Amino acid sequence: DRLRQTENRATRCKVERLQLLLQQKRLRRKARRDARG
Amino acid sequence: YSRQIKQVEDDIQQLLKKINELTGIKESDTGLAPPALWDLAADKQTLQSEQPLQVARCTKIINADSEDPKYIINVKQFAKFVVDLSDQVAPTDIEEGMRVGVDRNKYQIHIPLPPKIDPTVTMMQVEEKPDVTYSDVGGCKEQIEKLREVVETPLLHPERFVNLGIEPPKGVLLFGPPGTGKTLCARAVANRTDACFIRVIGSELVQKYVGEGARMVRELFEMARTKKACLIFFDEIDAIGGARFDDGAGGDNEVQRTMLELINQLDGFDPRGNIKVLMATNRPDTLDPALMRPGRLDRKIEFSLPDLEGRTHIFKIHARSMSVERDIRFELLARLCPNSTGAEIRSVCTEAGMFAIRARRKIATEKDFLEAVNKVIKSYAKFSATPRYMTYN
Amino acid sequence: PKVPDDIYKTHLENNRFGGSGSQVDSARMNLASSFVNGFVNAAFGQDKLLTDDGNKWLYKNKDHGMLSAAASLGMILLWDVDGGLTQIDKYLYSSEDYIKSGALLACGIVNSGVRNECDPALALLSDYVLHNSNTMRLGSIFGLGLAYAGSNREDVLTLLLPVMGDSKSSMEVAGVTALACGMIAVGSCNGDVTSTILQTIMEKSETELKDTYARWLPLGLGLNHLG
Ligand SMILES: Nc1ncnc2c1ncn2[C@@H]1O[C@H](COP(=O)(O)OP(=O)(O)OP(=O)(O)O)[C@@H](O)[C@H]1O
Incomplete structure (x- = not known):
């Protein structure tokens, strides 16, 4: 139960970081298209 | 070589x-x-x-x-x-x-x-849907929607009717101009359905003997009520019964018994329940008022001749296939044929294509459509099947 | 629409043919219910708590069924790499290894055929490839090969190479490992061929009994380079 709590906390901080990076890349992509149109 | x-x-x-x-x-x-x-x-x-x-x-x-x-x-x-x-x-x-x-x-x-039961009524189910849709039937959109809420939501989700506590209508008549109208949209209905679609043509019910038509009507209603819900199509009900007009010697009783017994079967004493029926004819004035009673004829879909917009839409519908020099004048074509029916319009486009393929051409022109319409609507104008039938007499 | 859900619900007409209806009362049919929210949810639908029939069933029975529903979630958001991770996240934190493994497989499925600059499939599945159990261990790698099949990246392929060299009891797991490695690359593959044939001699040479053994390790040799 302790191992799984440390594991799920490590996974969380990995997912929360990946979601931020995906959102930042998605915003950069969109900004290029919206500037071409 | x-x-x-x-x-x-x-x-x-x-x-x-x-x-x-x-x-x-x-x-x-x-x-x-x-x-x-x-x-x-x-x-x-x-x-x-x-x-x-x-x-x-x-x-x-x-x-x-x-x-x-x-x-x-x-x-x-x-x-x-x-x-x-x-x-x-x-x-x-x-x-x-x-x-x-x-x-x-x-x-x-x-x-x-x-x-x-009779093998004939087992054969009488069609189990095949023609490749016609609800998109390729234009000129009768309000007729379309009037038949949409007859053969859908009872077949789809019933919780709306249950929630409002309203029994859906059963007896629906669809009718239109003679020749152009109910038949092909009925094929569309059979295309979009899921349960069985029992065909009935009215001319076949008459038999050599007397009263057999009552027996096959009873049998078809029994095999229909074996299903939860099933669609019944009726064509040319004018021959299957006009009116009780007997005088002196018996006249046309043999079909009268059949029409009256189906009238008994539709209304009263624990009816079919979840069975949707529909009829289409060629002349409505000659039908019997007892068959015309609501509860057997609740909705009264009536198709007329399209004014301009339906004519333009059917010109779109049949003519997305033939070669043309891009530009068209389909609206002026429709103006050229004011009192014209849909199959007539398809015949016009057919004959325009025939004029195009006369010697060597591959794309018909506006004057080719003129050569179609003048030799269709105002060269075959002698018969045209319209005038004595727009009064339905 | 997002929730058509009709072909299952089309099973309404047949209940009154042959007599009484509602005779279907088994449990395996609930597996099909997964696809009822699974197969329809392809092409960018969404099931906000419409997987609740799968949710309580994921809390009811069938460990393999929990894995089944959690894997069917990855069919939901196919190719939505940016939005799909946020919908799968809620399951990565499950108290069930079947649900958590099915959510890892869902992350793999969402990336299948899409090369995202953030590598969210490799970056989430890596930590589970050598995991102690099997739900997160075995299913920890199948989605990653699905995510990184056409983008034939050898770097993560080397990361999944020692799974063949794990030499643990992986009678089901090493076979599907050969599936996942071959999913990245099969045919003219330098490490994948050697790892499979050596493991085949190491365990499958002394026991050749059931098709789980030698119908998946032969798939890792040359299926990608069959042309
Ligand atoms: N809205 C429409 N759009 C396109 N074509 C139409 C439309 N309505 C009728 N038609 C044409 O009508 C023709 C056949 O008419 P249909 O047979 O369905 O009519 P009806 O009134 O039932 O008469 P009958 O069955 O006696 O010929 C077809 O060629 C079809 O193209």
């Missing part, structure tokens, strides 16, 4: 025609299939058709009896007698008007009892 072309292929294709025949040594059926697949179960599963199952010919139940079963059985006309059949099923499947597989000496129960 050119006249020498016929020296390479023959040497192998004749050999091909030899080995394909040499493999084709399981044929000449005259009542068979390929016996590697026809007699694919030509093993003992052939003998078990013999010793486990025995004849078990048809029968007819007549009457029940008290305590121990001792039911009375008709064969067809052979004998009319009382036995107890067997014991492998509980004695609760026996009801009068049913047919068991019964032997001649042991009288085994075999299978439970299915009803017997």
Whole structure:
């Protein structure tokens, strides 16, 4: 139960970081298209 | 090489025609299939058709009896007698008007009892939907939606009707101009349906004898009520009944009995319930008022001749296929044919395409459509089938 | 629409043919219910708590069924790499190894045929490839090969190479490992061929009994380079 709590906390901080990076890349992509149109 | 072309292929294709025949040594059926697949179960599963199952010919139940079963059985006309059949099923499947597989000496129960009906009405279900949609029927959009909320939401989700506590309408008549109208949108309805779609053409119900039409109407209603919901289509109800007008010698009674008995069947004394029926005719003024009673004729879809917009839309619909020099004047074409029907318009585009393919052309022109319309609507104007039928008289 | 859900619900007409209806009362049919929210949810639908029939069933029975529903979630958001991770996240934190493994497989499925600059499939599945159990261990790698099949990246392929060299009891797991490695690359693959044939001699040479053994390790040799 302790191992799984440390594991799920490590996974969380990995997912929360990946979601931020995906959102930042998605915003950069969109900004290029919206500037071409 | 050119006249020498016929020296390479023959040497192998004749050999091909030899080995394909040499493999084709399981044929000449005259009542068979390929016996590697026809007699694919030509093993003992052939003998078990013999010793486990025995004849078990048809029968007819007549009457029940008290305590121990001792039911009375008709064969067809052979004998009319009382036995107890067997014991492998509980004695609760026996009801009068049913047919068991019964032997001649042991009288085994075999299978439970299915009803017997005419093979003609079994054939009469079409089980095929024509490739017409709700998109390729234009000019009658409000007629379209009026039939959309007859054969959909009862077939789809019933929680709306249950929530409002409203029984959906049953008797719907769809009608239009003669010749152009109800038939093809009925094919569209049969395309978009899911349950069975029982065809009825009114001319076939008349028989050589008297009262048989009542029997097949009873049978078709019985096989319809075997289903939860099933669609019934009626065509040309004018011949299947006009009115009770008898005077002196009997006139047209033989169809009158059929129309009145279907009138009894539609209304009163625990009706079909979840069965949707619909009728379309050619002249509405001649129908009987009792058939015209709501509860059998609740909705009154009436199609008219399209004014301009339906004509433009059908011009779009039939003519997305023929070659043209891009630009068109379809609206002025519709203005050229004010009182014109849809199949007439399709005939106009057909003859325009025929004029295009006369000598060598591949794309019809605006003057080609003019040459279509003038030799359709105002050269065949003598008959046109419209004027005595727009009054429906 | 997002929730058509009709072909299952089309099973309404047949109940009144042959007599009484509602005779279907088994449990395996609930597996099909997964596809009822699974197969329809392809092409960018969404099931906000419409997987609740799968949710309580994921809390009811069938460990393999929990894995089944959690894997069917990855069919939901196919190719939505940016939005799909946020919908799968809620399951990565499950108290069930079947649900958590099915959510890892869902992350793999969402990336299948899409090369995202953030590598969210490799970055989430990596930590589970050598995991102690099997739900997160075995299913920890199948989605990653699905995510990184056409983008034939050898770097993560080397990361999944020692799974063949794990030499643990992986009678089901090493076979599907050969599936996942071959999913990235099969045929003219330097490490994948050697790892499978050596493991085949190491365990499958002394026991050749059931098709789980030698119908998946032969798939890792040359299926990608069959052309
Ligand atoms: N809205 C429409 N759009 C396109 N074509 C139409 C439309 N309405 C009718 N038609 C044409 O009507 C023709 C056939 O008419 P239909 O048979 O359905 O009519 P009806 O009134 O039932 O008469 P009948 O069955 O006696 O010929 C078809 O060629 C079809 O293209």
